[PDB]
Enzyme design. Structure first.
Site, mmCIF file in Angstrom:
data_model
loop_
_atom_site.group_PDB
_atom_site.id
_atom_site.type_symbol
_atom_site.label_atom_id
_atom_site.label_comp_id
_atom_site.label_asym_id
_atom_site.label_seq_id
_atom_site.Cartn_x
_atom_site.Cartn_y
_atom_site.Cartn_z
ATOM 1 N N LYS A 199 46.118 -15.276 81.951
ATOM 2 C CA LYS A 199 47.045 -16.067 81.166
ATOM 3 C C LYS A 199 46.363 -17.380 80.814
ATOM 4 O O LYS A 199 45.738 -18.015 81.679
ATOM 5 C CB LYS A 199 48.344 -16.294 81.946
ATOM 6 C CG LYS A 199 49.165 -15.016 81.985
ATOM 7 C CD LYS A 199 50.223 -14.955 83.078
ATOM 8 C CE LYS A 199 51.200 -13.819 82.740
ATOM 9 N NZ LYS A 199 52.390 -13.734 83.624
ATOM 10 N N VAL A 250 48.424 -13.926 76.974
ATOM 11 C CA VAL A 250 48.186 -13.011 78.081
ATOM 12 C C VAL A 250 47.140 -11.985 77.660
ATOM 13 O O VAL A 250 47.247 -11.376 76.586
ATOM 14 C CB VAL A 250 49.478 -12.311 78.520
ATOM 15 N N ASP A 274 62.321 -19.259 85.778
ATOM 16 C CA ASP A 274 62.497 -18.511 84.530
ATOM 17 C C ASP A 274 62.510 -17.001 84.780
ATOM 18 O O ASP A 274 61.668 -16.249 84.309
ATOM 19 C CB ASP A 274 61.435 -18.882 83.508
ATOM 20 C CG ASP A 274 61.743 -18.306 82.126
ATOM 21 O OD1 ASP A 274 62.848 -17.711 81.932
ATOM 22 O OD2 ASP A 274 60.872 -18.427 81.252
#
Length: 451
Positions: A213, A199, A304
């Protein structure tokens, strides 16, 4: 053709966009829709596309810098309560509660309760003008503001400062910018590494601050990611990190809205997180639930959801990042919900055991995220190694209430952790529960009654 006026400076990024200064007058064809509008500058004679959220119709209420439209009471308070705002910092918004009325929201300081925001209902009937107390009435909202910038005259405090705000993000980097050349990006600061890439803070086209990213080659098929990125592109909500653009050749670059304070997990573990009061942590949870409530309405799945994948901006704005990306990871171990790179401690058992990832396994993960929120980022299941987690959870073990967590939020966690997915709450309910968690003590609106 209506004349629009520029709410902010805009510096050109491409060749077909039009740069303009705040207050500049622009011609746009009347009933135009979309994120980027073709404009002709009435001041420079230059022409090009402009971001539509940077303008408002000339001499409209929307063209006043203190007019904030349909912003909610909660989000107006977030902006008003920033520590750099003097007393009497203010904005005007629509009333969420009386159709046709407005609200003057003003920062204030009280010797007993401290920094606080007071809301005054502005009414307008045909029998008169705009007013907070019927004894004093105005032709316009503009006149009301100008009057109260000179005298409190019943208000808690004189109006002093228009509530400050950052220049809004544009929706997209340019008209028709999506798959972009790698060269258009400049990676400046490496914010960290994840299991599958890095990142960065960077710049697109020498102008626009972005997050980038990057994914290690081999992580996922560029073609499969492009197809999924079409879906993610369409998820637009103030509590979701916006997806701007992609470099589709390996190593894939994913360009997103920059979030100035980093990941929630680091924020909670760091020096600013040390001092967070429970109402602040619950407001952060409420914002996450609101982003996931949108994901739920759009029949999407995050996969996630944890504090590492929540990003923090100014005034404790929290937004959900990287939604849906984990579905595409092509590592055999991770795809089997195994290995060092897989967050088993946030994973509902039906997802771990059978690969059934759904909005309800996101609800489970949100439950675990709430423990990170109330423990300043402590790892879940304090005593356990990752190897033993799934067996314990499958046998019915659940974390007890963390010592710093109120029982009512642990009750909420336990609902998120029901064994049967269809017994867990909705994100619609989680958001509503967290938004109403604390029963406020003040009245909603100051009694305009007589001031």
């Amino acid at each position: 053709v209506t004349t629009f006026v520029a709410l902010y400076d805009y510096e050109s990024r491409t060749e077909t966009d039009l740069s303009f200064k705040k207050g500049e007058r622009l011609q746009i064809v009347n009933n135009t829709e979309g994120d980027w509008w073709l404009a002709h500058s009435l001041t420079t004679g230059q022409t090009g596309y402009i971001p539509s959220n940077y303008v408002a119709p000339s001499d409209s209420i929307q063209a006043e810098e203190w007019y904030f439209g349909k912003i909610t009471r909660r989000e107006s308070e977030r902006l008003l309560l920033n520590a750099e705002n003097p007393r009497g910092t203010f904005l005007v918004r629509e009333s969420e509660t009386t159709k046709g009325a407005y609200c003057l929201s003003v920062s204030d300081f009280d010797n007993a309760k401290g920094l606080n925001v007071k809301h005054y209902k502005i009414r307008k009937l045909d029998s008169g003008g705009f007013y907070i107390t019927s004894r004093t009435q105005f032709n316009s909202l503009q006149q009301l503001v100008a009057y109260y910038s000179k005298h409190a005259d019943g208000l808690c405090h004189r109006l002093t400062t228009v509530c400050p705000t950052s220049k809004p993000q544009t929706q997209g980097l340019a008209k028709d910018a999506w798959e972009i050349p790698r060269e258009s990006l400049r990676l400046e600061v490496k914010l960290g590494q994840g299991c599958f890439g890095e990142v960065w803070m960077g710049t697109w086209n020498g102008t626009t601050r972005v997050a980038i990213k990057t994914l290690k080659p081999g992580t996922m098929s560029p073609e499969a990611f492009l197809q999924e990125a079409q879906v993610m592109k369409k998820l637009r909500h103030e509590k979701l990190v916006q997806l701007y653009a992609v470099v589709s050749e390996e190593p894939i670059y994913i360009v997103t809205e920059y979030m100035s304070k980093g990941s929630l997990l680091d924020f909670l573990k760091g020096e600013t997180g040390k001092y967070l009061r429970l109402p602040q942590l619950v407001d952060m949870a409420a914002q996450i639930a609101s982003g996931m409530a949108y994901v739920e309405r759009m029949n999407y799945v995050h996969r996630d959801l944890r504090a590492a994948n929540i990003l923090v901006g100014e005034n404790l704005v929290c937004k959900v990042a990287d939604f849906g990306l984990a579905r595409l990871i092509e590592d055999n171990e991770y795809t089997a919900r195994q290995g060092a790179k897989f967050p088993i401690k946030w994973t509902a058992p039906e997802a771990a055991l059978y690969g059934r990832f759904t909005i309800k396994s996101d609800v489970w993960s949100f439950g675990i995220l709430l423990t990170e929120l109330t423990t300043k980022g402590r790892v879940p299941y304090p005593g356990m190694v990752n190897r033993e987690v799934l067996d314990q959870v499958e046998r019915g073990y659940r974390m007890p209430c963390p010592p710093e967590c109120p029982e009512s939020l642990h009750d909420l966690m336990c609902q998120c952790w029901r064994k049967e997915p269809e017994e867990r709450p909705t994100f619609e309910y989680l958001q509503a529960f967290l938004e109403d968690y604390f029963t406020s003590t003040e009245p909603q609106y100051q009694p305009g009654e007589n001031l």
